[PDB]
Amino acid sequence: SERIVINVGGTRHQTHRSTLRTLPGTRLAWLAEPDAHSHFDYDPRADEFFFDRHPGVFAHILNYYRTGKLHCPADVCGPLYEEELAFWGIDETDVEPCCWMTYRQHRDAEEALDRRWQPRIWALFEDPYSSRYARYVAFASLFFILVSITTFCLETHERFNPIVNKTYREAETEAFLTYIEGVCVVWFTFEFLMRVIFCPNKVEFIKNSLNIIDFVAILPFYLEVGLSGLSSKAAKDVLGFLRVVRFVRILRIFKLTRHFVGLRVLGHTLRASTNEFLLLIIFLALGVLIFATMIYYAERIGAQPNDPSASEHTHFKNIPIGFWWAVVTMTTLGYGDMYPQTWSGMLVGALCALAGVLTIAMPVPVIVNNFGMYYSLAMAKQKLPKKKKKHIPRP
Amino acid sequence: SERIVINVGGTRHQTHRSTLRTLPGTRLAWLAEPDAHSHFDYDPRADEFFFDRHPGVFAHILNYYRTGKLHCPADVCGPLYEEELAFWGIDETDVEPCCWMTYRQHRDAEEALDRRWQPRIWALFEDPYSSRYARYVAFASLFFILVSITTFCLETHERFNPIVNKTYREAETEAFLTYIEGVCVVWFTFEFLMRVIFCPNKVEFIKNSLNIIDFVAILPFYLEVGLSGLSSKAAKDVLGFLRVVRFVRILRIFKLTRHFVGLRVLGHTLRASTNEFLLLIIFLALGVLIFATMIYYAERIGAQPNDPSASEHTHFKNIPIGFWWAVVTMTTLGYGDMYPQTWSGMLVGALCALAGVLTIAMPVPVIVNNFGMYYSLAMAKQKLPKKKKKHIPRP
Amino acid sequence: SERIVINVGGTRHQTHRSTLRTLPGTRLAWLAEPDAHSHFDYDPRADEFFFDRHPGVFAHILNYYRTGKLHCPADVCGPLYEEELAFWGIDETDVEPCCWMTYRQHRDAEEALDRRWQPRIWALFEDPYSSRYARYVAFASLFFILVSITTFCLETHERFNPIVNKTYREAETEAFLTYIEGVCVVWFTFEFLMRVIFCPNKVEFIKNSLNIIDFVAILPFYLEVGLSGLSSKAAKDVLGFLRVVRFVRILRIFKLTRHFVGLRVLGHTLRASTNEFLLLIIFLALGVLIFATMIYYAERIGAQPNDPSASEHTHFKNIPIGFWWAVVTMTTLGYGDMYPQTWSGMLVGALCALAGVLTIAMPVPVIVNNFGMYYSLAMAKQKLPKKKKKHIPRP
Amino acid sequence: SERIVINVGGTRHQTHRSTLRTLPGTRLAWLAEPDAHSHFDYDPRADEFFFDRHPGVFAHILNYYRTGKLHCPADVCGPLYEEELAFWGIDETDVEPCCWMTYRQHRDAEEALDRRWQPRIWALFEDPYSSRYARYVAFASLFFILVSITTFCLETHERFNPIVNKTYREAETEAFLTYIEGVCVVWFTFEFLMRVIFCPNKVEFIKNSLNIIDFVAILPFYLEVGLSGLSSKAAKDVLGFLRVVRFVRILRIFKLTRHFVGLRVLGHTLRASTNEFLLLIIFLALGVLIFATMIYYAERIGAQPNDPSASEHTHFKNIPIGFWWAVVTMTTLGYGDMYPQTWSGMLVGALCALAGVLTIAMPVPVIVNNFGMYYSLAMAKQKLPKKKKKHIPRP
Ligand SMILES: CC(C)CCC[C@@H](C)[C@H]1CC[C@H]2[C@@H]3CC=C4C[C@@H](OC(=O)CCC(=O)O)CC[C@]4(C)[C@H]3CC[C@]12C
Ligand SMILES: CC(C)CCC[C@@H](C)[C@H]1CC[C@H]2[C@@H]3CC=C4C[C@@H](OC(=O)CCC(=O)O)CC[C@]4(C)[C@H]3CC[C@]12C
Ligand SMILES: CC(C)CCC[C@@H](C)[C@H]1CC[C@H]2[C@@H]3CC=C4C[C@@H](OC(=O)CCC(=O)O)CC[C@]4(C)[C@H]3CC[C@]12C
Ligand SMILES: CC(C)CCC[C@@H](C)[C@H]1CC[C@H]2[C@@H]3CC=C4C[C@@H](OC(=O)CCC(=O)O)CC[C@]4(C)[C@H]3CC[C@]12C
Ligand SMILES: CC[C@H]1NC(=O)N(c2ccc(Oc3ccc(C)c(OC)c3)nc2)C1=O
Ligand SMILES: CC[C@H]1NC(=O)N(c2ccc(Oc3ccc(C)c(OC)c3)nc2)C1=O
Ligand SMILES: CC[C@H]1NC(=O)N(c2ccc(Oc3ccc(C)c(OC)c3)nc2)C1=O
Ligand SMILES: CC[C@H]1NC(=O)N(c2ccc(Oc3ccc(C)c(OC)c3)nc2)C1=O
Ligand SMILES: [K+]
Ligand SMILES: [K+]
Ligand SMILES: [K+]
Ligand SMILES: [K+]
Ligand SMILES: [K+]
Ligand SMILES: [Zn+2]
Ligand SMILES: [Zn+2]
Ligand SMILES: [Zn+2]
Ligand SMILES: [Zn+2]
């Protein structure tokens, strides 16, 4: 009576029926029922029930039954213990805080990480290795995107933008850069039309940020061509705004870098560390405010109440400029454009540097470990390709 | 004789009675008593005592009995082993140093982390979500605190503080900033009176730093209003001191940020890493002193004993200024306002930079791991809300 | 029927024959064959098969058989579990991603880390301790390499390179430096000839980068001596190019430092962290481009469309210069030669500093842990010299 | 025959006699002897030998016997496994490299961390809490050491060192600083004589660096007093040298800080990380040399062979100055006194910054983990005071 022997994989586990009955509604409680002999795998010769499971972790499940707190064995994986808990009927949300992080770790990382020739036309954007012409198409896209970025950067330069005499010496960009941009634009509009020919799930295609960027980058050239026909002052202002807008041409490099695994892992880490990024932002804002105020007040210790020369011997004429000084000092950047020149200001600056180091190194390690785990998991996915299951399940 | 079998959860542990008698006053010693058969769960058919506990950790407790040193199994938690030690009667303070840190880790983290409508009136400060008007009240407090901080920072500026001609061109702050501050102050005094209406445990309410800050921030406006009535030079000096005191208005943001979990975790980490902060302070002070002296003496190698031009070609006219140079160089800030200009001074500066890196990276990682553990524990508290126990203890 | 008992090192493991038959072609499946009694170690008295292996890990192998996913026990080593898997016939490539990194860790680190007197002549380069004259030879090589590097650095100086009056005041290097270089060169050519005397595997000897460097460093002196005979303008240009080429003399220090274990470990880490170095390069390039464009556009907010004074109050005259500013700001270097001077530019600079910190601290920790593991393994190789096996294997 | 059952703590371990005989000279081999029944604890009823030890680790020792490689269980401590190996006769130096670091970790940390009233006189230096007058004596030493350091730093200042008119306006230090130094010196010489009164083990007392520092700091005042009597030019030169020597007064603070546990741990870490410090030094030297040469040659790309204006537009007039630039850039200090001004020089500077970050972060983490382990161990020594053994060993 009250003595029940559970044989888990050849290991005899002995406990009381009241111990099993403690947790109701589970398989071991059903074992603690007067019909378990007729409801389970029981042999009368040994008076023991046989379960074909892992005894090393069944020890810990029975220890949960005994004590009342569910822990996870540190000598097996979270997934292994989770499968055993699922079989034995235990809720995985009963696990103690001392086990929760190491238990829900691989699962959290995995959840963070995760018309005849119309397919032939849609293969234009597809993996360059997945076809023969796709390789050349992708290489041409690489070359044209790089050339467009280079032409943009050269357009911002001064050697290619001279001041020719005109209605005064107005500075105009050399026209060969515009011709190169025109060639790039005709290629890019060919590619965009070829990809728009095949647009399954047009809602998702429009919602796609990469194609949004491509259209936004292709608009300004045509808007400029149309604008130049009309010679008005408002046309000139819109032309200048279009020149500002042309910065979207450098965003086309994310199309090229989208396939890099480290970039995808970084995106996953950014999406999963929102709380830590907010923590860093709040720490920086509080430190910047406090240290800007402190340096403003410390750089005029002993100054007269209304002497205009109070702010004449300092870089800290106000608190908003101390904001910039404080961020530069806390990041250990130290440009040197503004620094304290008084003993109290130097004390405050030393405090600011140390506090910046500490409150930068608080959440950055959390984000770093998140990235490390996600990168390792993705790399394992790359090192271990899916293969034959090799395991034939029992019917 | 002398052979005793302990059956712990179906696992037969065999040891000598003298081995059990080694540690007196404990449950296993009582088992090694001639009456254990009449004092414990003993069956004569098998000549074994049955205990319904964890055998994997009972192995380690018996190993303590055998060898004489108590260790902790690395395949279970500190709390699990602590519960087993509490049941078996072993003192948790006998654990070896090789186990103490990993054993007393979750426990240390947990100890670091932890009149009809008078409640309706006291709900004014309560959680904004805990009521309907509290949401609007908290949003108004947010807006007014931010506006007061903005008005303070603008008051320190020069665009809003012109030099109008008066008894000379005295610089006076624009009065619209003072009017905005007055509106903020009337709102804040309404809030303070409404919270003072309900003040249970007035000793604790006075001791509360947040309300102390609120009163200290609300005093200066009224003190200024009263002071302006009396036109005296001492009144002007007290007015200037009140202008200095007005910096307490930026401390009201801690009322808003008090509810952030990362801020509470940071406070816990600061309170728990006092020794490491003192270690960092001592390291920095020793390095600053040594390197200031070394750079002072190295920047005049070969100089004449009393030539006044000895200090003319150097930024290091003395040692106290080398203190500032040394802290800036050791934090890898590098403002550049003062640097060595001699070969020996550059050697000393390289030494200073490397030593600063090392003696900054010594205790900062300890503080960082403390923060990481506390943050993870608090986050687990947030991921796993308290629910039904699900465990019905035996009577 | 269907009940089979496996005795692994005195521990009875019980499972179903269908469970063993799940994974075909392995030793346990052969055990689940009607002839296992005649094909294995079986005794009819106990109806159990005996295997003389580790039961604690056999539990996990049988758990793989039971559930269908292969994991690794966290309480043993990867090599231990690998040997057990090799014995039991399980493929090591079936291990789950949650186990792959901690399993294939030591193995990955190990794979990263790994004519009468003609031998007497070839002993000239050999380990200095491996002979008597080799010690003096290696010390002489040390002294001469250091002297050559010192003479190079002094040659670049201005105190040793005066402007003597000649066909004008042409600046010529003092001839005593050239004489010292000549002595060093005659020693080095003696050493090179002595090592070329014994050149086993001449293909590998030529492919050896150290000897390539030695020959490239010894060529310029003789090329200069031959060139000075011919007095032509093209001869002067080739002489200047040879002066540029003389920088290869500082590369001879890698011959001296080749034997340092930390340098070999660093080479292994560089070879094994190519993916992480590419990740760092891509992150830096993307950040530099984005932040250079952003600072260029933010430093002229509100500027006129074609006012030439738009770029007059800024260090950021174009985007390529912003590349340099961005790298300096992201590395937290902060030279201060160019910084933002506008509120929007300061916002962008704060963003740049924080983003640089984060995207520098993402892959650098991965590289750091790689180096740490490899260094620890190499140091263990140094702490535990190979000794007698002490284990006599059974025939 | 050939079948032997070992009963280790109630757990039956079964193996072959040849398996035990594999490792000769050990206790299990002696068990595999025809007399083991008469040489060990054997009962004929069960045909098993009983050992009262830990079965979980005996499994791993027997696995060493079986396979031939000795590993350490990850679910127990190094000290626990070491005690078991010592009992079973296995050499601890047979452990595999995959186990050596985690096994020899606590032991390595522990080895790194470790005439009537003549005792009354010698109590003058003793722990201030260990007596009543010692508290006041130590506080007086604190005050006098701090005052001496302050007087030194003030002596280096210019406000306290005016140029009074004398044989010209020679700058002489104010005499009140010298009087304060004289008071400090008389106190310190009293303390030194009182400590020299009781000098057990005079060889060790002389070898003690703290007392060496105290004597060296007390000499210069008396040497100055004696020197001032003789008015000679050589006397003035020796006086100036004594002024230089007076820097030893700041070294007296190590007497005060010697008792801090973090300082003792830092000393242990410095003594135990000599290899890593040499690694850091070699990495820095190689990087500094390479990048100084590279920046020197990159800052004059396209310059004429002998144009004196080649070095006129650069901070890098030679390679030795590039050494300083390179160290400043690699430490991410960035003073800004010298920076590249050419596109190639900026490329080289970006390379230098990244390489400096990487080769600083390579061995610094190793040193940091060493310090962390030693600090944790020392802190455990402080958290767990030695108490009653509580364990009565068997005779
Ligand atoms: C400081 C430097 C390193 C830039 C800042 C890094 C991140 C803020 C950005 C830059 C590049 C971005 C990546 C560029 C491209 C992609 C592909 C993108 O996938 C697609 O859009 C594919 C088509 C689709 O399904 O929409 C997913 C996000 C990701 C990884 C981005 C995630 C966010 C990243 C890492
Ligand atoms: C460099 C920047 C990040 C500022 C420095 C950070 C810490 C020095 C300070 C700033 C904000 C502080 C927090 C602001 C508000 C609170 C709420 C406070 O709780 C209350 O006062 C609630 C009412 C009460 O019971 O008293 C407890 C401390 C804490 C977490 C503070 C702990 C110490 C913190 C983290
Ligand atoms: C920033 C500083 C630290 C320099 C950058 C470090 C690495 C980029 C370089 C510098 C020195 C190099 C090492 C110098 C010498 C050798 C010996 C070399 O071995 C031989 O060539 C021996 C003969 C042969 O078999 O070829 C193997 C590479 C290694 C470790 C090199 C690996 C790459 C290292 C670490
Ligand atoms: C950059 C700053 C942090 C200074 C550099 C730190 C270390 C290079 C030095 C500074 C203070 C030194 C400590 C000062 C005093 C002592 C006490 C000393 O003990 C005694 O001399 C006691 C009497 C004796 O038995 O000799 C042992 C070394 C230690 C810990 C020293 C170890 C080396 C330390 C940590
Ligand atoms: C027009 C008044 C002018 N005169 C003067 O002596 N002061 C002053 C007075 C007291 C003070 O106190 C400090 C000191 C240091 C810190 C960090 C601090 O943080 C807010 C406050 N700071 C300046 C003036 O501003
Ligand atoms: C008025 C004397 C004037 N003349 C002179 O030659 N010196 C001098 C002498 C010796 C010295 O030694 C050093 C060198 C380097 C360091 C780091 C050091 O640390 C304390 C001490 N330093 C300077 C003078 O100060
Ligand atoms: C000749 C036109 C001249 N006038 C003007 O007002 N601008 C301008 C307009 C809008 C803008 O928008 C921003 C603002 C910030 C950032 C970071 C940004 O990133 C690309 C873009 N930046 C500048 C001019 O350049
Ligand atoms: C008096 C000759 C003068 N003229 C000239 O054009 N040069 C030159 C030639 C080639 C070169 O090559 C490089 C480039 C970059 C690096 C990093 C490098 O590392 C050693 C070498 N560097 C300079 C001169 O010095
Ligand atoms: K840093
Ligand atoms: K810096
Ligand atoms: K800097
Ligand atoms: K700087
Ligand atoms: K830095
Ligand atoms: Zn737990
Ligand atoms: Zn232990
Ligand atoms: Zn697993
Ligand atoms: Zn191992």
Token pair, residue A177, equals 């850069």
For D342, which DSSP code?
S
Which residue CA neighbors atom 2 of ligand 8 most closely? D305
D275 contacts chain C (CB < 8 A):
yes
Give the β-pairing of C11-16 and D3-8. Answer: unpaired
Task: For chain A, give the secondary structure using H, E and C.
Answer: CCEEEEEECCEEEEEEHHHHHHCCCCHHHHHCCCCHHHHCCEECCCCEEEECCCHHHHHHHHHHHHHCCECCCCCCCHHHHHHHHHHHCCCHHHECHHHHHHHCCHHHHHHHHCCCCHHHHHCCCCCHHHCCHHHHHHHHHHHHHHHHHHHHHHHCCCCCCCECCCCCCCECCCHHHHHHHHHHHHHHHHHHHHHHHCCCCHHHHHHCHHHHHHHHHHHHHHHHHHHHHCCCHHHHHHHHHHHHHHHHHHHHHHHHHCCCHHHHHHHHHHHHCHHHHHHHHHHHHHHHHHHHHHHHHHCCCCCCCCCHHHHCCCCCCCHHHHHHHHHHHHCCCCCCCCCCCCHHHHHHHHHHHHHHHHHHHCCHHHHHHHHHHHHHHHHHHHHCCCCCCCCCCCC
> Residues C81, C56: contact at Cβ < 8 Å?
no
Query: Which of these, D42, B41, A244, lies nearest to C306 by C-alpha position?
Result: A244
> Residues B353, D331: contact at Cβ < 8 Å?
yes
Q: How far is the CA of B76 from the centre of ligand 14 (A)?
A: 7
D324 contacts chain C (CB < 8 A):
no
> Residues D73, C76: contact at Cβ < 8 Å?
yes
Residues 6+ apart with CB under 8 A from A287: A326, A330, A352, A355, A356, A359
> Residues A182, A221: contact at Cβ < 8 Å?
yes
Q: Helix or strand or coil: residue C384?
A: coil
Token pair, residue D384, equals 């767990």
Residues 6+ apart with CB under 8 A from D292: D319, D320, D321, D322, D323, D325, D326
Give the β-pairing of D11-16 and D42-43. Answer: unpaired
Nearest CA-CA distance, residue D200 and chain B, Å: 31
User: What residue in C sits closest to D76 (Cα-Cα)?
Assistant: C75
| Long-range residue pairs from A235-243, CB within 8 A, at least 24 positions apart, any chain | A236/C305, A237/C305, A239/C305, A240/C305, A240/C306, A243/C305
Helix (H) or strand (E) holding B42: strand B42-43
Q: Which amino acid is at D183?
A: V
Phi, psi angles (nearest 5°) of residue C163: -100, 90
Q: Determine the longest span between alpha carbons in chain A, in angstroms.
A: 111
For a pocket test of ligand 2, which of B213, B263, B273, B370 has the largest count of ligand atoms closer than 8 A to its C-beta? B263
For B117, which DSSP code?
S
> Residues A370, A267: contact at Cβ < 8 Å?
no
Please report where in the chains the tokens 């009521």 appear, as a residue. Answer: B131
Residues 6+ apart with CB under 8 A from D228: D235, D239
Chain A residues whose CB is inside 8 A of the C104 CB are 383
Could you please report the per-residue DSSP string of C116-171? -SHHHHHTTSS-GGGSSHHHHHHHHHHHHHHHHHHHHHHHTSSTTS-B-------B
> Residues D77, D89: contact at Cβ < 8 Å?
no
Q: What torsion, rounded to 10 degrees, do the Cα atoms C239, C240, C242, C245 define?
A: 180
Q: Which amino acid is at A387?
A: K
Helix (H) or strand (E) holding C379: helix C364-383
- Residues 184-223 on C with a CB inside 8 Å of D are none
Q: Which residues have a C–N gap over 2.5 Å right after them in chain C?
A: 114, 167
Out of D75, D332, D336, closest to residue A75 by CB: D75
CA distance A76 to A59: 13
The alpha carbon of residue A361 and the mean position of all alpha carbons in its chain are separated, in whole angstroms, by 19
> Residues C282, A257: contact at Cβ < 8 Å?
yes
The CATH number of residue A62's host domain is 3.30.710.10
Helix (H) or strand (E) holding C372: helix C364-383
CA distance A284 to B283: 25
CA distance C168 to C162: 13
> Residues A35, A78: contact at Cβ < 8 Å?
no
Count of all residues that appear for chain D in the document: 395
Q: What torsion, rounded to 10 degrees, do the Cα atoms B167, B173, B174, B177 define?
A: -150
CA distance C15 to C62: 8
Query: Which of these, B183, B200, B360, lies nearest to B285 by C-alpha position?
Result: B360
Could you please report the per-residue DSSP string of C53-82? S-HHHHHHHHHHHHHS-B---TTS-HHHHH
Characterize C54-73 residue by residue with b for buried, 16 or more Cβ atoms within 10 angstroms of its Cβ, and e for exposed: bbbbbbbbbbbbbbbbbbbb
Q: Where are the beta strands (DSSP E) in D57-209?
A: none
Nearest CA-CA distance, residue D157 and chain A, Å: 14
Query: Which of these, D137, D210, D162, D218, lies nearest to D185 by C-alpha position?
Result: D218
Could you please report the per-residue DSSP string of D181-225? HHHHHHHHHHHHHHHHHS-SSHHHHHH-HHHHHHHHHHHHHHHHH
Phi, psi angles (nearest 5°) of residue C249: -70, -25
CA distance C106 to A158: 56
Phi, psi angles (nearest 5°) of residue B72: -115, 135
Q: In what order do the strands lie in the sheet with D42-43?
A: D11-16, D3-8, D48-51, D42-43
Residue C99 among known ligand-binding residues: yes
CA distance B56 to B81: 10
CA distance B280 to A349: 16
**How many other CB atoms sit within 10 Å of the CB of residue A32?**
21
Q: Helix or strand or coil: residue C43?
A: strand
Chain C residues whose CB is inside 8 A of the A360 CB are 357
CA distance D359 to C376: 17
CA angle B358, D267, D141 (to 5 degrees): 110
* C-alpha atoms less than 13 angstroms from C-alpha of D47 in its C-beta half-sphere: 6
For B312, which DSSP code?
T
Query: Which of these, A382, A383, A374, lies nearest to A268 by C-alpha position?
Result: A374
Q: Helix or strand or coil: residue D171?
A: strand
> Residue B238, exposed/middle/buried by CB under 10 A (0-12, 13-18, 19+)?
middle
Q: In what order do the strands lie in the sheet with C48-51?
A: C11-16, C3-8, C48-51, C42-43
**How many other CB atoms sit within 10 Å of the CB of residue A258?**
11
> Residues D121, D198: contact at Cβ < 8 Å?
yes
Q: Which amino acid is at C197?
A: I
Q: Output the CA torsion sign for D273, D278, D284, D290.
A: negative
CA distance D269 to B366: 15
> Residues B255, B214: contact at Cβ < 8 Å?
yes
For C92, which DSSP code?
G
In angstroms, what CA-CA distances link C344 with C275, C293, C339, C347, C352? 36, 13, 12, 5, 12
> Residue D100, exposed/middle/buried by CB under 10 A (0-12, 13-18, 19+)?
buried
> Residues D4, D30: contact at Cβ < 8 Å?
no
For B163, which DSSP code?
B
CA distance A272 to A107: 13
CA distance D9 to C395: 32
Please report where in the chains the tokens 């542990």 appear, as a residue. Answer: B13
**How many other CB atoms sit within 10 Å of the CB of residue A140?**
12
Give the β-pairing of D48-51 and D3-8. Answer: parallel
For C47, which DSSP code?
T
Residue B315 among known ligand-binding residues: no
- Subunits close to D (at least 3 CB pairs below 8 A): A, B, C
> Residues D231, D352: contact at Cβ < 8 Å?
no
CA distance B172 to D119: 72
Q: Helix or strand or coil: residue B342?
A: coil
Residues 6+ apart with CB under 8 A from B310: B300, B303, B304
Count of all residues that appear for chain A in the document: 395
A262–C363 CB contact, under 8 Å = yes
Beta bridge partners of C51: C8
Domain containing residue C89: 3-112
Helix (H) or strand (E) holding B16: strand B11-16
CA distance A189 to C198: 66
* C-alpha atoms less than 13 angstroms from C-alpha of C335 in its C-beta half-sphere: 21
* C-alpha atoms less than 13 angstroms from C-alpha of C237 in its C-beta half-sphere: 4
Token pair, residue D15, equals 């193996």
Resolution of this structure in Å: 2.9
CA distance C48 to C50: 7
CA distance D123 to D195: 9
Helix (H) or strand (E) holding B382: helix B364-383
- Residues 334-363 on D with a CB inside 8 Å of C are 334-336, 339, 343, 346, 349-350, 353-354, 357-359, 361-363
CA distance C27 to C88: 6
Nearest CA-CA distance, residue B197 and chain A, Å: 31
Please give the number of the atom of ligand 8 that sits closest to the Cα of D348.
17
Ligand 7 neighbours, Cβ below 6 Å, are A 240, 244, 247; C 293-294, 297-298, 300-303, 305, 344, 348
For a pocket test of ligand 7, which of C290, C294, C295, C297 has the largest count of ligand atoms closer than 8 A to its C-beta? C297
Out of D74, D75, D336, closest to residue A336 by CB: D336
CA distance C372 to D365: 8
Token pair, residue D124, equals 């003058």
CA distance B119 to B130: 12
> Residues A71, B81: contact at Cβ < 8 Å?
no
Could you please report the per-residue DSSP string of C191-231? HHHHHHHS-SSHHHHHH-HHHHHHHHHHHHHHHHHHHHHS-
Give the β-pairing of D11-16 and D3-8. Answer: antiparallel
* C-alpha atoms less than 13 angstroms from C-alpha of D321 in its C-beta half-sphere: 18
**Cα R_g (chain B), whole angstroms:** 34
User: What residue in D sits closest to A75 (Cα-Cα)?
Assistant: D75
